[PDB]
């Protein structure tokens, strides 16, 4: 009857989509964490009805006149129903207000162009002005090369807003999701006050293939997994998705500014 089932990419076990979604897209057979779409992620971590979307309508331009770019974007928009690869806004969890940004790797692999950079900057700046904590879910599998140097500069653009937010004494939780690679990994994803990730998520600057080729050796299986990054001191915690909401709620409570 189609759509009603989902096959696990890792263990190949078939599951009711409904039941899988109720398990926050964790395969109940092998515990593989399947991608969660931006709105479902926001739903999982917020009080019902508390989400206000920011800059929902912003759309990409073609500043380099890169051939076929705006056409590739339109297709991703039709396929995912998103405007661009990030959803931003404010929400509450157990009554505590926070700014949020969730990247969706379905859209142009979650590669960061001007729109993602500007939307992330606007919610971070809003959180600075309103003294709110900020939570970013990274998901990026390459660079937005159609915007060339302008894409690279988004690493710097988002960093200046982030550091100003940090200097105001406010909390940034970086929530790295599968995959987090390249410029995103080497910018906002790696500088949370607290860095959290999910089991087996792949995180790194360069890809497995490029590294194996450069060093002429075979990388271990666990190479660049969240577990590996935790072992190497780069994550505060690896969080099974079933503890995600509770974990975020506790961190927000610890950091809640005596206020109002």
């Amino acid at each position: 009857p189609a759509g009603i089932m989902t096959k696990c990419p890792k263990c190949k076990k078939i599951m009711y989509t409904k039941e899988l979604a109720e398990n926050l897209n964790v395969c109940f057979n092998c515990d593989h964490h399947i991608a969660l779409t931006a709105y479902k992620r926001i739903e999982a971590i917020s009080d019902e009805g508390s989400f206000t979307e920011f800059d929902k309508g912003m759309t990409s331009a073609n500043p380099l006149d890169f051939p076929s770019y705006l056409e590739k974007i339109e297709k991703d928009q039709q396929k995912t129903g998103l405007k661009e690869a990030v959803v931003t806004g404010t929400a509450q969890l157990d009554g505590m207000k926070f700014g949020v940004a969730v990247m969706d790797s379905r859209f142009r692999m979650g590669s960061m162009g001007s729109v993602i950079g500007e939307k992330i900057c606007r919610i971070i700046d809003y959180c600075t002005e309103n003294r709110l904590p900020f939570i970013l879910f990274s998901a990026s599998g390459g660079a937005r090369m159609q915007e060339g140097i302008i894409s690279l500069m988004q690493m710097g653009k988002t960093s200046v807003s982030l550091k100003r937010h940090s200097d105001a004494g406010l909390l940034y939780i970086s929530y790295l999701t599968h995959p987090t690679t390249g410029g995103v990994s080497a910018s906002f994803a790696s500088v949370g006050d607290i860095n959290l990730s999910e089991p087996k998520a792949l995180i790194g600057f360069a890809g497995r293939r490029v590294i194996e080729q450069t060093i002429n050796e075979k990388l271990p299986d666990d190479f660049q997994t969240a577990e590996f990054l935790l072992e190497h001191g780069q994550l505060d915690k690896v969080v099974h998705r079933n503890d995600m909401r509770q974990t975020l709620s506790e961190i927000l409570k610890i950091h809640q500014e005596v206020t109002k």
Binding site: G57, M58, T59, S60, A61, P63, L64, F66, P67, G113, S114, V115, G117, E118, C121, A143, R144, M145, E147, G148, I149, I150, S151, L152, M153, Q154, M155, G156, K157, S159, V160, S161, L162, K163, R164, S166, D167, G182, G183, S185, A186, S187, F188, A189, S190, V191, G204, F205, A206, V210, I211, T214, I215, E217, L219, F223, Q224, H232, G233, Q234
Partner: protein, 309 residues
Amino acid sequence: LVPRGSMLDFEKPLFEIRNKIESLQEEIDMLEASLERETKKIYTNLKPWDRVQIARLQERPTTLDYIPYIFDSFMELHGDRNFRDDPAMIGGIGFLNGRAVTVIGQQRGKDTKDNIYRNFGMAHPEGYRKALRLMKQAEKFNRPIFTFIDTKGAYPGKAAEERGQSESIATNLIEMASLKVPVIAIVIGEGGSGGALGIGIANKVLMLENSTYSVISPEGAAALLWKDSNLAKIAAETMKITAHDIKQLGIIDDVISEPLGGAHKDIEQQALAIKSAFVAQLDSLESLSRDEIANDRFEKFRNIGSYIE
């Protein structure tokens, strides 16, 4: 990189003309004066891919080549106080016309054996952390910082991932963002993506006219977009990675001309042009306080990008 001696494809006219004037009266020198004309024409009308090749020359001058011509009493300082002194990232302290400054940059290596020692100017996370330590020193003592970007990219290795390549670069971006001293960067080689930007979060950014600055290598883009690595040339032209392109987008503040034929033809002359640019740029920042200097950098990066509301 391009081994010393072998001629570039865009030089063919010059080598063609060379033989004939060597298969010689009034005419021979007709060719001699024509060769000179053709040399100036070719090197005054360089194409994006021609510039890329010039940037990738083995003999392209390096950071340690320029420093002695620009700064006085330069003292190289080593280490990240954490793990290792990275050969690919150098730094130190010196004077720029009597004013104490800190200088940092990727060091590519002058010859083949040196390339291996310098890891081709491809830094490990210890390299970025060393750069940060020296910049924090600069900040403490209120010294301006000059950075030399010269890298095909941060090193993509196993140990570099283990020791937090991504983190070392990301931390540099946020800490450079709020530095309370002026920071002036110049791309003298290739501007390899995040590895370049890791010492590139500056108040002013300069590029040598034949240097590049790209989010990805032309070969990488060509393999990904067209699935054919051999289309690097079009990838490069389509991404717009030349100095004049970057300036057109308002992302850098000035393009520094190189001697005819490329920076390697006259290091001293090149250095004096760099030095002149450093002095100008630093002067333009003189009236800014410690907080204003940081805010200036904030506005610079915050306003980069184009989108449709």
